[PDB]
Amino acid sequence: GTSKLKYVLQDARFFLIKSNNHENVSLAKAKGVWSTLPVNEKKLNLAFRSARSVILIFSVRESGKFQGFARLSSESHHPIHWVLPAGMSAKMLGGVFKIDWICRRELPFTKSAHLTNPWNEHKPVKIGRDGQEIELECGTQLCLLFPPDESIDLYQVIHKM
Numbered sequence: 061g062t063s064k065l066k067y068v069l070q071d072a073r074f075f076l077i078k079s080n081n082h083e084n085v086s087l088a089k090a091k092g093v094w095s096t097l098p099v100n101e102k103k104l105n106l107a108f109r110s111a112r113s114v115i116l117i118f119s120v121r122e123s124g125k126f127q128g129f130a131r132l133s134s135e136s137h138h139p140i141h142w143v144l145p146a147g148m149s150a151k152m153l154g155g156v157f158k159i160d161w162i163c164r165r166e167l168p169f170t171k172s173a174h175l176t177n178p179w180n181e182h183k184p185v186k187i188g189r190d191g192q193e194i195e196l197e198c199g200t201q202l203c204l205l206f207p208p209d210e211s212i213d214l215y216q217v218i219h220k221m
């Protein structure tokens with residue numbers, strides 16, 4: 061069903077999070093961690109303190125899809141063997157966020173064409189810079205479009221709220 065998912069998403073905040081490659085999403089799915097540049101680290105830390113749930117909705121650049129979504133379980137803290145873009149040192153990253161995956165299934169952008177994000181000029185929700193916040197209603201509807209991930213039990217996530 062969808063009821064525990066809706067409970068986790070109640071009054072949540074949502075952020076569009078890009079990845080440079082599939083490898084880092086794979087690492088994040090296996091290890092329950094994410095790292096960003098300092099600009100988005102600051103935004104996510106502020107949001108983590110502000111809301112019952114902060115949801116990261118992941119999209120590998122140029123893939124045409126979202127690869128799933130996860131809930132922050134921590135603020136950032138300061139080695140994960142990320143596959144970084146050429147010329148980027150691990151020292152340019154902010155800290156590491158712990159995350160609990162809510163859905164590891166993908167959703168193609170074609171399926172979210174009817175959703176617009178008020179915080180990005182009501183452009184289709186797939187459109188946004190890395191770190192773009194997605195307004196509550198749009199973010200909730202987007203998350204509900206993903207195929208159910210029956211491998212995940214949200215019982216333990218609810219207890220972290």
Ligand SMILES: CN(CC1=NC(=O)NC(=O)C1)Cc1ccco1
Binds near residue numbers: 077078080142
């Ligand atoms: C794991 N992490 C991958 C990404 N995390 C993000 O938050 N945005 C991205 O584009 C890619 C490291 C990183 C931060 C910036 C570039 O590589």
